[PDB]
Design an enzyme around this catalytic site. Structure first.
Site, PDB file in Angstrom:
ATOM      1  N   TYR A  14       0.830  -1.196   0.000  1.00  0.00           N
ATOM      2  CA  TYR A  14       0.000   0.000   0.000  1.00  0.00           C
ATOM      3  C   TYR A  14       0.872   1.256   0.000  1.00  0.00           C
ATOM      4  O   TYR A  14       0.645   2.170  -0.789  1.00  0.00           O
ATOM      5  CB  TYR A  14      -0.947  -0.005   1.205  1.00  0.00           C
ATOM      6  CG  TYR A  14      -1.616   1.326   1.465  1.00  0.00           C
ATOM      7  CD1 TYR A  14      -2.807   1.664   0.842  1.00  0.00           C
ATOM      8  CD2 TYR A  14      -1.055   2.242   2.347  1.00  0.00           C
ATOM      9  CE1 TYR A  14      -3.415   2.876   1.092  1.00  0.00           C
ATOM     10  CE2 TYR A  14      -1.655   3.455   2.600  1.00  0.00           C
ATOM     11  CZ  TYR A  14      -2.836   3.767   1.969  1.00  0.00           C
ATOM     12  OH  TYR A  14      -3.442   4.977   2.212  1.00  0.00           O
ATOM     13  N   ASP A  38      -9.668   9.306   7.705  1.00  0.00           N
ATOM     14  CA  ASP A  38      -8.364   9.898   7.482  1.00  0.00           C
ATOM     15  C   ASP A  38      -8.514  11.406   7.403  1.00  0.00           C
ATOM     16  O   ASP A  38      -8.922  11.927   6.366  1.00  0.00           O
ATOM     17  CB  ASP A  38      -7.760   9.343   6.187  1.00  0.00           C
ATOM     18  CG  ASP A  38      -6.322   9.783   5.947  1.00  0.00           C
ATOM     19  OD1 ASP A  38      -5.869  10.798   6.510  1.00  0.00           O
ATOM     20  OD2 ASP A  38      -5.643   9.099   5.152  1.00  0.00           O
TER      21      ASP A  38
END
Length: 125
Positions: A14, A38
Site C-alpha cells: 500500500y 483519514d
C-alpha cells in the site's frame, strides 16, 4: 484472512503504491464495502468511488512521496498497524506528515477498513 506475514506485505505494498501515485491499484486493494477514516476523528468515507476520489485529491499532483518509518505490526486476525511519513507541499514549500495507519483485511485479502492517525501535531516544515 491474510496471515500476520501477509498483512505486513500488503500494508507495505500500500505504501509503495501511494509513493508512486497508482490510484487504481490503491483502490483495487480496498473491498467494495470499505471505509476510510483519514484523519481518524473525521467521518468515514464509504466505497470504492469515494475512496478513489479521496486518493485523487491527495495524490493527484504527482509529487507526493511516502515511506515506512518502522516495521509493520501485524495481528493474527487480519489486522495491522504501520508508521510512515508522507512528504508533500504547503503553498510552495516542502512539508511532511507522520502517520500511523491501522487496517483490517477481509477474508479475500482486501482492505475492509483503514484508519489514519495524525493531526497538525504531526505536520512539519
Amino acid at each position: 484472512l491474510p496471515t500476520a506475514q501477509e498483512v505486513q506485505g500488503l500494508m507495505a505494498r500500500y505504501i509503495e503504491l501511494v509513493d508512486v501515485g497508482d490510484i487504481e491499484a490503491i483502490v483495487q486493494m480496498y473491498a467494495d464495502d470499505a471505509t476510510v477514516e483519514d484523519p481518524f476523528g473525521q467521518p468515514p468515507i464509504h466505497g470504492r468511488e469515494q475512496i478513489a476520489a479521496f486518493y485523487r485529491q491527495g495524490l493527484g499532483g504527482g509529487k507526493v512521496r511516502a515511506c515506512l518509518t518502522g516495521p509493520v505490526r501485524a495481528s493474527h486476525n487480519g489486522c495491522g498497524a504501520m508508521p510512515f511519513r508522507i512528504e508533500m507541499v504547503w503553498n510552495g514549500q516542502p512539508c511532511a506528515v507522520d502517520v500511523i495507519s491501522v487496517m483490517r483485511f477481509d477474508e479475500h485479502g482486501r482492505i475492509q477498513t483503514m484508519q489514519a492517525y495524525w493531526s497538525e501535531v504531526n505536520l512539519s516544515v
